[PDB]
Design a binder for this molecule. Structure first.
Ligand SMILES: CCCCCCCCCCCCCC(=O)SCCNC(=O)CCNC(=O)[C@H](O)C(C)(C)COP(=O)(O)OP(=O)(O)OC[C@H]1O[C@@H](n2cnc3c(N)ncnc32)[C@H](O)[C@@H]1OP(=O)(O)O
Ligand SMILES: CCOC(=O)c1cnc2ccc(OCc3ccc(N4CCNCC4)nc3)cc2c1SCCC#N
Ligand SMILES: [Mg+2]
Length: 411
């Protein structure tokens, strides 16, 4: 069934995943000295390449590979078109390791044929609360809490093989070479997400989308006057009416985040993230990097009253190519990123996200049902999508958890 994945330290079936009681490594412990020092062998016509993520030309190359060959939805209606500025932001967070960015190029002409990227993340990934309960009833609290300390691991994203090289087993070679480069730095776990089902997710959630420009969503038959709008006299006026938003935020105290807000945002986010079973831990430098506004990339607002930040939200932008549509070639989507509410209902905070996003020209707001995202779906008129996002670890046994116990947003 899986000539590659059966060779790897991941849970091999749902059954296995249902038996797992404690968090911990799957593989034999290893040391850096046991890992090969030489890159994995590859065909003599290809060569490994470590792009320089501060070289414009190198980020452009990666940009073009992904524009034309990265992920499409199962109906090939969309392909992501991550921008060069977004790639620089996602690939170069504080303390990133340039060697974790792995590419294959054709030797002859230096054509980029494949890519995978790893970045550091500090993750809480100890045993979940409801497994730790069952572990007091067993006498077993010490083994259940053994890996509670946040761990410095790798987050994998942007795996891409050029369409002309598909189904030639190049993706396993990429994964093996990234694993080697991460293990050479004494890191032995990774976290990653995918739309597809692989062996074997520890959590899975549906996507949700909120229409902000229903006219456009129609012209690119994603909405297409959704079937339920037919019996209306006037399907489009009703559609716009339903999804209309205010012009300006409703919360007194909302403004863009600025650098002097970083400590307060760190505190309120870390307090909120703590409640979930799997979630990141951010330094002030990581909060600065992932939440300070960057044009075209990430947008973050705080509610400040009486000079205290009490709430905030963020969203980031990923445009998609609209496949087979030259009238409307691009979808401008906003994705809910981290947030924390202490003074207002979450629905009132995220209503202001939608207002801001609409004001700034976004066509749709998307999210996975992680964090407390289900608490505002109905009131804010999100609809469940096609598609899911599945969360995975490499070399980490972990019980199945609901997506509302996951606090890691994956770009
Ligand atoms: C400690 C550090 C560890 C670091 C590493 C942690 C692991 C990270 C793992 C990577 C996390 C990535 C997170 C993201 O970026 S998810 C986004 C993935 N990217 C895309 O979907 C872009 C469009 N598609 C492609 O570029 C290609 O179709 C890819 C590259 C996906 C497969 O290329 P191709 O179609 O040319 O096939 P092949 O003949 O070379 O290889 C076939 C083998 O590949 C397995 N496959 C297929 N899809 C995926 C998938 N999304 N993740 C993991 N494996 C996948 C498949 O089961 C099969 O194995 P097996 O079934 O035969 O056993
Ligand atoms: C109009 C509402 O739909 C969208 O806005 C949209 C746009 N571009 C895409 C591009 C590709 C795509 O493929 C499915 C997919 C595949 C992978 C993935 N990952 C991979 C790893 N990193 C996080 C996201 N997320 C989604 C779905 C999409 C979708 S559906 C998923 C987002 C939502 N809702
Ligand atoms: Mg291949």
């Amino acid at each position: 069934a899986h000539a590659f994945w059966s060779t790897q330290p991941v849970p091999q079936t749902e059954d296995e995943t249902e038996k797992i009681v404690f968090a911990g490594p799957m593989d034999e412990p290893k040391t850096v000295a046991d890992i090969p020092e030489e890159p994995y062998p590859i065909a003599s016509t290809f060569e490994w390449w470590t792009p320089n993520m501060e070289a414009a030309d190198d980020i452009h190359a990666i940009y073009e590979l992904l524009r034309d060959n990265y992920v499409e939805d199962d109906d090939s209606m969309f392909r992501f078109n991550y921008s060069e500025e977004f790639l620089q932001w996602a690939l170069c967070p504080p303390n990133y390791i340039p060697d974790w960015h792995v590419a294959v190029r054709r030797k002859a002409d230096k054509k980029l044929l494949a890519f995978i990227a790893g970045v550091p993340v500090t993750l809480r990934m100890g045993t979940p609360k409801y497994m730790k309960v069952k572990a007091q009833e067993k006498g077993e609290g010490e083994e259940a809490a053994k890996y509670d300390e946040p761990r410095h691991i790798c987050e994998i994203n942007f795996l891409c093989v050029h369409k002309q090289l598909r189904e030639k087993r190049l993706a396993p070679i990429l994964i093996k070479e990234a694993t080697r480069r991460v293990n050479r730095t004494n890191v032995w776990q990774a976290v990653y997400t995918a739309g597809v089902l692989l062996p074997t997710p520890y959590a899975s959630g549906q996507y949700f989308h909120r229409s902000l420009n229903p006219e456009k969503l129609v012209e690119i038959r994603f909405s297409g006057i959704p079937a339920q709008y037919q019996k209306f006299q006037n399907p489009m006026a009703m559609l716009k009416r339903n999804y209309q938003l205010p012009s300006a935020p409703k919360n007194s105290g909302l403004r863009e985040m600025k650098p002097s807000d970083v400590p307060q945002v760190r505190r309120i986010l870390m307090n909120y993230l703590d409640s979930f079973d799997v979630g990141p831990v951010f330094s002030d430098a990581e909060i600065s990097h992932y939440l300070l506004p960057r044009d075209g990339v990430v947008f973050t607002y705080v509610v400040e009253n009486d000079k205290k930040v009490t709430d905030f939200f963020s969203f980031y932008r990923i445009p998609s190519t609209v496949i087979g549509n030259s009238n409307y070639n691009l979808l401008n989507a906003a994705y809910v990123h981290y947030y924390a509410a202490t003074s207002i209902p979450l629905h009132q905070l995220i209503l202001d996200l939608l207002i801001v996003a609409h004001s700034r020209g976004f066509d749709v707001c998307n999210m996975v049902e992680i964090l407390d995202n289900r608490s505002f779906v109905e009131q804010l008129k999100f609809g469940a999508g096609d598609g899911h996002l599945r969360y995975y670890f490499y070399n980490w046994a972990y019980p199945k958890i609901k997506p509302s116990q996951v606090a890691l947003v994956m770009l």
